[PDB]
Design an enzyme around this catalytic site. Structure first.
Site, PDB file in Angstrom:
ATOM      1  N   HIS A  22       0.835  -1.196   0.000  1.00 50.06           N
ATOM      2  CA  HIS A  22       0.000   0.000   0.000  1.00 50.06           C
ATOM      3  C   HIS A  22       0.876   1.254   0.000  1.00 50.06           C
ATOM      4  O   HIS A  22       0.637   2.184  -0.777  1.00 50.06           O
ATOM      5  CB  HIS A  22      -0.891  -0.020   1.253  1.00 50.06           C
ATOM      6  CG  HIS A  22      -1.760   1.191   1.418  1.00 50.06           C
ATOM      7  ND1 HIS A  22      -3.126   1.154   1.235  1.00 50.06           N
ATOM      8  CD2 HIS A  22      -1.468   2.455   1.811  1.00 50.06           C
ATOM      9  CE1 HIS A  22      -3.640   2.340   1.512  1.00 50.06           C
ATOM     10  NE2 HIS A  22      -2.655   3.148   1.864  1.00 50.06           N
ATOM     11  N   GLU A  23       1.887   1.280   0.870  1.00 50.12           N
ATOM     12  CA  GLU A  23       2.781   2.436   0.960  1.00 50.12           C
ATOM     13  C   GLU A  23       3.633   2.553  -0.300  1.00 50.12           C
ATOM     14  O   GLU A  23       3.952   3.659  -0.741  1.00 50.12           O
ATOM     15  CB  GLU A  23       3.671   2.341   2.206  1.00 50.12           C
ATOM     16  CG  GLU A  23       2.887   2.217   3.515  1.00 50.12           C
ATOM     17  CD  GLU A  23       1.906   3.366   3.743  1.00 50.12           C
ATOM     18  OE1 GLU A  23       0.962   3.185   4.543  1.00 50.12           O
ATOM     19  OE2 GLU A  23       2.078   4.449   3.138  1.00 50.12           O
ATOM     20  N   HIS A  60       1.628   4.449  -2.786  1.00 49.26           N
ATOM     21  CA  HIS A  60       1.679   5.901  -2.681  1.00 49.26           C
ATOM     22  C   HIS A  60       2.962   6.393  -3.349  1.00 49.26           C
ATOM     23  O   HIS A  60       2.943   7.383  -4.079  1.00 49.26           O
ATOM     24  CB  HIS A  60       1.658   6.344  -1.213  1.00 49.26           C
ATOM     25  CG  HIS A  60       0.311   6.247  -0.567  1.00 49.26           C
ATOM     26  ND1 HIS A  60      -0.802   6.890  -1.066  1.00 49.26           N
ATOM     27  CD2 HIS A  60      -0.100   5.599   0.550  1.00 49.26           C
ATOM     28  CE1 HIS A  60      -1.839   6.644  -0.285  1.00 49.26           C
ATOM     29  NE2 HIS A  60      -1.441   5.863   0.703  1.00 49.26           N
ATOM     30  N   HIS A  95      -5.934   6.826  -2.454  1.00 50.25           N
ATOM     31  CA  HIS A  95      -6.844   5.887  -1.809  1.00 50.25           C
ATOM     32  C   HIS A  95      -8.087   5.556  -2.626  1.00 50.25           C
ATOM     33  O   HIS A  95      -8.537   6.349  -3.457  1.00 50.25           O
ATOM     34  CB  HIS A  95      -7.274   6.434  -0.448  1.00 50.25           C
ATOM     35  CG  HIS A  95      -6.202   6.374   0.595  1.00 50.25           C
ATOM     36  ND1 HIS A  95      -6.263   7.093   1.768  1.00 50.25           N
ATOM     37  CD2 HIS A  95      -5.050   5.667   0.647  1.00 50.25           C
ATOM     38  CE1 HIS A  95      -5.194   6.832   2.498  1.00 50.25           C
ATOM     39  NE2 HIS A  95      -4.442   5.969   1.841  1.00 50.25           N
TER      40      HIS A  95
HETATM   41 ZN   LIG Z   1      -2.580   5.252   2.291  1.00 54.15          ZN
END
Ligand SMILES: [Zn+2]
Ligand SMILES: [Zn+2]
Ligand SMILES: [Zn+2]
Ligand SMILES: [Zn+2]
Length: 195
Positions: free
Chosen positions: A141-142, A145, A151
Site C-alpha cells: 500500500h505504501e 503511494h 486511496h
Molecule cells: Zn494510504
C-alpha cells in the site's frame, strides 16, 4: 497493460524490531523475505518486478531517532537514506519496518510520487500483525503511494484507506489509472533499470 518496470527495494528493520523478535536477526530476515514475496506477488499485475536489494537490521542502536510520529520519523529516514544508505548500494526505494506503535494509531506512511527521489523514495511500515501477509499488504500500500496511487475512496483493494479484515491482493482500477498517470507525468528513471 503497463511497460516493464522494476523496484529494487531496500528494507531497514529498526531496533524495536530486534527487541520484539528477541534479538533473533535470523527470524527477522525470514520474516522480511516472506513479506517481500507477498509484495512481489501483489505487484506482478502492474508489470513491476520487485526485488529485495538489501536488508539492514539496526541491532546496535537506531541510526536515526525512531519516534511514534510517523511524519517526523519518515523525514529523518529519508535524509538518512539519501545521505547514507544510497552511498552503500544503489536501490530505488527504502522502507523502514518499525515495531513502534504510531501516535495516531496508523500503520504506515509514504511520500506520494516519491519513487526514485533520493530523499522522498521512502516509506514507513509498522509491524502491526503476526500475520505477515497483512503487514506485506501495508508495505504494498505504501509502495503504492510512492508510485503515485491515491486511496480507493473498493474496500478490500490494496489502496483501501482502512486495513480490511480480509484484504485482497488486487489493485483497484482507480489505482491502476493513478499508476498510469504516474508513468506518464513522472516516469521516474530508476525503475526502468532491471537488477
Ligand atoms: Zn494510504
Ligand atoms: Zn537491543
Ligand atoms: Zn504525531
Ligand atoms: Zn544490468
Amino acid at each position: 497493460r503497463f511497460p516493464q518496470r522494476y523496484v529494487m527495494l531496500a528494507i531497514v528493520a529498526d531496533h524495536g524490531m530486534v527487541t520484539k523478535y528477541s534479538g533473533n536477526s535470523s527470524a527477522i530476515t525470514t520474516r522480511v523475505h516472506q513479506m517481500v514475496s507477498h509484495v512481489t506477488e501483489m505487484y506482478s499485475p502492474l508489470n513491476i518486478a520487485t526485488t529485495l536489494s538489501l536488508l539492514r537490521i539496526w541491532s546496535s542502536k537506531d541510526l536515526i531517532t525512531v519516534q511514534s510520529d510517523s511524519s517526523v520519523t519518515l523525514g529523518s529516514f529519508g535524509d538518512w537514506r539519501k545521505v547514507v544508505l544510497l552511498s552503500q548500494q544503489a536501490h530505488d526505494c527504502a522502507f523502514l519496518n518499525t515495531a513502534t506503535a504510531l501516535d495516531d494509531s496508523t500503520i504506515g506512511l509514504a511520500y506520494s510520487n516519491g519513487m526514485c527521489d533520493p530523499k522522498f523514495s521512502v516509506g514507513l511500515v509498522q509491524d502491526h500483525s503476526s500475520n505477515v501477509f497483512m503487514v506485506a499488504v501495508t508495505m504494498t500500500h505504501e509502495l503504492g503511494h510512492n508510485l503515485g496511487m491515491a486511496h480507493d475512496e473498493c474496500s478490500s483493494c490494496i489502496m483501501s484507506p482502512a486495513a480490511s479484515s480480509g484484504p485482497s491482493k488486487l489493485f483497484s482500477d482507480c489505482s491502476k489509472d493513478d499508476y498510469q498517470t504516474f508513468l506518464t507525468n513522472t516516469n521516474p528513471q530508476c525503475i526502468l533499470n532491471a537488477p
